[PDB]
Design a binder for this molecule. Structure first.
Ligand SMILES: CC(=O)N[C@@H]1[C@@H](O)[C@H](O[C@@H]2O[C@H](CO)[C@H](O)[C@H](O[C@]3(C(=O)O)C[C@H](O)[C@@H](NC(C)=O)[C@H]([C@H](O)[C@H](O)CO)O3)[C@H]2O)[C@@H](CO)O[C@H]1O
Ligand SMILES: CC(=O)N[C@@H]1[C@@H](O)[C@H](O[C@@H]2O[C@H](CO)[C@H](O)[C@H](O[C@]3(C(=O)O)C[C@H](O)[C@@H](NC(C)=O)[C@H]([C@H](O)[C@H](O)CO)O3)[C@H]2O)[C@@H](CO)O[C@H]1O
Lengths: 191, 191
């Protein structure tokens, strides 16, 4: 997996658009939706099961976590997945992030703030990799790239992000219940 | 999986470009290449392992199997995957296609001509589904969408296309040795 392209994606700035002014699926044959907030618009690709969530028409109170791609699509700035339902109320939750270095092994523990009731895997993946780039030298060297991030739910279900490669596009639009995240366990296979 | 978008895709015309005048990967951060032949140009997305075949710069001796997408990308007509090495010899082979109707039903056999030494899964998938629409009422209506196409190779390796949904984008750029295809087996679970 191209290391230039990997760190380049995770080093990019993100745009958190809460409560979009609009989200429009022009037609079911389109593989995306036009979103806009505060006189700025974007086209957001629907490349996974997220496509089933936005039938033709307008949809209110959606959120978008954007990471702007290199490609312009339908004449607009483009991002893939990262859509979710806006919050119903003010919300913030603090979960444990436990980072383990592995062969071998005590974890380095910190806290991570969850403010969305419904959150895309794009957002969690992006923010958690930033944290690891800032705090654990992830992608700080060509050898600092192997491991996994595991988001564990209160019911013990889990979602895994493999660090040697980018999150797969068809998973960027998957969402989970942020109010039900129990903890985040990280394995780093490099020192 | 949306039936409308499924059928819309396989009903489309294809454009087969043999020996491109150019194929240009502008930069390693891009997710595609610019291709052109004669005076027509397109942008082709590299969304699977195909991305590793085209580093920055030009690449000669390539073919493109295009199916134009709804989205314009980089101000151009767009297609996903479908790239391959052009033939070095005038290779042609007639492969058996065996259609079995799996309703708990001898196979109905015909021939399918391969003219490329290396062929994208996008091209085989697309042509084989046209044949099945033309001859076996695939996507003729609702309930005419279940089954699979299996491309079998000389060493018993195989490649499968599930008919109930579109070929996955990350597989459109995968290529196989057309000279080693042994047969094509189709199981239709409808009538
Ligand atoms: C080459 C390539 O990228 N191929 C992918 C393949 O990786 C991918 O499978 C998924 O791979 C990820 C790691 O990259 C996980 O292993 C997925 O399993 C899990 C997960 O741990 O995340 C299992 C887990 O039990 C699931 N949780 C629930 C509640 O069901 C999650 C969940 O379904 C996903 O995280 C949601 O995005 O998946 C594993 O599926 C496949 C499928 O994406 O696609 C290939 O192209
Ligand atoms: C929901 C979703 O789309 N998930 C996909 C998941 O389906 C996909 O897995 C592939 O699924 C296809 C059928 O759709 C096949 O079953 C793949 O298995 C095979 C195949 O039969 O095609 C197995 C076979 O042994 C392999 N042949 C060789 C020589 O290795 C092939 C081959 O690797 C592929 O055909 C090449 O594209 O695969 C199965 O992998 C996964 C991975 O694409 O992605 C999820 O997102």
């Amino acid at each position: 997996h191209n290391y230039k392209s990997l760190k380049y994606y995770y080093s990019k700035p993100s745009i958190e658009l809460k409560n979009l002014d609009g989200l429009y699926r022009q037609k079911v044959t389109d593989k995306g939706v036009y979103v806009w907030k505060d006189r700025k618009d974007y086209f957001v690709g629907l490349l996974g099961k997220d496509i089933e969530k936005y039938p033709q028409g307008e949809h209110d109170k959606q959120d978008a976590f954007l990471v702007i791609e290199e490609e312009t699509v339908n004449g607009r700035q483009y991002s893939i997945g990262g859509l979710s339902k806006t919050n119903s109320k003010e919300f913030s939750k603090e979960v444990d992030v436990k980072v383990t270095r592995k062969e071998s092994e005590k974890s380095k523990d910190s806290k991570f703030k969850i403010t969305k009731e419904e959150i895309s895997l794009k957002e969690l993946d992006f923010k958690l990799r930033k944290k690891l780039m800032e705090e654990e030298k992830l992608y700080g060297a060509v050898n600092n790239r192997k491991g996994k991030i595991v988001v564990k739910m209160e019911d013990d279900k889990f979602y895994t992000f493999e660090l040697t490669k980018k999150l797969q596009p068809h998973r960027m639009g998957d969402t989970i219940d942020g109010t039900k995240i129990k903890e985040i366990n990280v394995e780093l296979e490099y020192k």
